[PDB]
């Protein structure tokens, strides 16, 4: 299992514009297009992102290309962020995947706000951090996904994704 396989379990693959759990316009493998309520604004972001006239629909191929850029940007964001890099560098390979997943879903900013959990993960207090991460809007809004990520930080294994 790797970061790409893991995120594709969590995000899915949709070739037509769709709405987030949050109601936002997305496509592909969790690629948010706009937080704006117009399908028209979304369609315009899509064609800008792909470089063609898409009419709301993309190929597998374009989906994967967007996914490649997004994971690359997530990693680079972690590495550029003062709060995040320090925790990343301290973690093992599997837990590193779990932080990347959070960054992809919520953005750098969002994750950097989990101050106390970050602190516990750096300290390698796995059980405590798992309990603290669960006290969040994130966990309450997307509990099955959050709990997969949380088990990943708790165990350091890919067990939560075996099932799936």
UniProtKB/Swiss-Prot annotation:
EC number(s) given by UniProt: 3.2.1.17
Reactions accelerated catalytically: Hydrolysis of (1->4)-beta-linkages between N-acetylmuramic acid and N-acetyl-D-glucosamine residues in a peptidoglycan and between N-acetyl-D-glucosamine residues in chitodextrins
InterPro entries given in the database record: Endolysin_T4_type, Glyco_hydro_24, Lysozyme-like_dom_sf, Lysozyme_dom_sf, Phage_lysozyme-like, T4-type_lysozyme
UniProt KW Hydrolase keyword: yes
Recorded consequence of changing residue 117 to V: 50-fold decrease in enzymatic activity
Active site (catalytic residues): 11 (proton donor/acceptor), 20 (proton donor/acceptor)
Gene3D superfamilies reported for this sequence: 1.10.530.40
Compartment list: Host cytoplasm
Physiological role: Endolysin with lysozyme activity that degrades host peptidoglycans and participates with the holin and spanin proteins in the sequential events which lead to the programmed host cell lysis releasing the mature viral particles. Once the holin has permeabilized the host cell membrane, the endolysin can reach the periplasm and break down the peptidoglycan layer.
Protein name (Swiss-Prot/TrEMBL): Endolysin
Organism: Enterobacteria phage T4
């Amino acid at each position: 299992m790797n970061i790409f396989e893991m995120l594709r379990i969590d995000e899915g693959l949709r070739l037509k514009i769709y709405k987030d759990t949050e109601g936002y316009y997305t496509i592909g493998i969790g690629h948010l297009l706009t937080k704006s309520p117009s399908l028209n604004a979304a369609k315009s972001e899509l064609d800008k992102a792909i470089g063609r006239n898409c009419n709301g629909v993309i190929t597998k191929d374009e989906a994967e290309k967007l996914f490649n850029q997004d994971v690359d940007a997530a990693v680079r964001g972690i590495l550029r962020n003062a709060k995040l890099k320090c925790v990343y560098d301290s973690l093992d390979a599997v837990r590193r995947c779990a932080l990347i997943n959070m960054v992809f879903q919520m953005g750098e900013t969002g994750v950097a706000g989990f101050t106390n959990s970050l602190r516990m993960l750096q300290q390698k207090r796995w059980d405590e951090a798992a309990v603290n991460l669960a006290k969040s809007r994130w966990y309450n809004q997307t509990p099955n996904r959050a709990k997969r990520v949380i088990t990943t930080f708790r165990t350091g294994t890919w067990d939560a994704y075996k099932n799936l």
